[PDB]
């Protein structure tokens, strides 16, 4: 089937976050795309109440479950807040979550 205009707007925001690269050309999204399975990483799933990754967000988007951009932002904020809970502020993952959140809000503003 085809994508609604809203779905196309969401996908542009999604792809912006996914494709963002720092000054060295590293994609900050890499660790956020796909969490390991609960058997692979039990301590994550036993610590974080609502596990979330970019692939889960992309599925919800393609299933036409987000009503507007603020709905999808809510799930990005969950993912990023989870990364801040699970990791330390000095860590690379924690820092990248903050950059990508900024990229997300700046993309929403541009659109
Ligand atoms: C790789 N370990 C240290 C942490 C992973 C995450 O914190 C994570 C990955 C994907 C989505 C959310 C996360 O908190």
From Swiss-Prot:
Widely expressed. There is a cross-link at residue 1 (Glycyl lysine isopeptide (Lys-Gly) (interchain with G-Cter in SUMO2)). The modification Phosphoserine is found at residue 37. It is found in: Nucleus. It comes from the Eukaryota. Residues 1-111 form the Bromo domain. Component of the SWI/SNF-B (PBAF) chromatin remodeling complex, at least composed of SMARCA4/BRG1, SMARCB1/BAF47/SNF5, ACTL6A/BAF53A or ACTL6B/BAF53B, SMARCE1/BAF57, SMARCD1/BAF60A, SMARCD2/BAF60B, perhaps SMARCD3/BAF60C, SMARCC1/BAF155, SMARCC2/BAF170, PBRM1/BAF180, ARID2/BAF200 and actin. Interacts with PHF10/BAF45A. Interacts with acetylated 'Lys-14' of histone H3 (H3K14ac), and may also interact with other acetylated or methylated Lys residues on histone H3. This is Protein polybromo-1. It comes from Homo sapiens (Human).
């Amino acid at each position: 089937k085809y994508m609604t205009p809203m779905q196309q707007k969401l996908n542009e925001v999604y792809e912006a976050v996914k494709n963002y690269t720092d000054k060295r050309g590293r994609r900050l999204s890499a660790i956020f795309l796909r969490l390991p399975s609960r058997s692979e990483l039990p301590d994550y799933y036993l610590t974080i109440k609502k596990p979330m990754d970019m692939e889960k967000i992309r599925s919800h988007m393609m299933a036409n479950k987000y009503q507007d951009i603020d709905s999808m932002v809510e799930d990005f904020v969950m993912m990023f807040n989870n990364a801040c809970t699970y990791n330390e502020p000095e860590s690379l993952i924690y820092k990248d979550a903050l950059v990508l959140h900024k990229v997300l809000l700046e993309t929403r503003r541009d659109l």
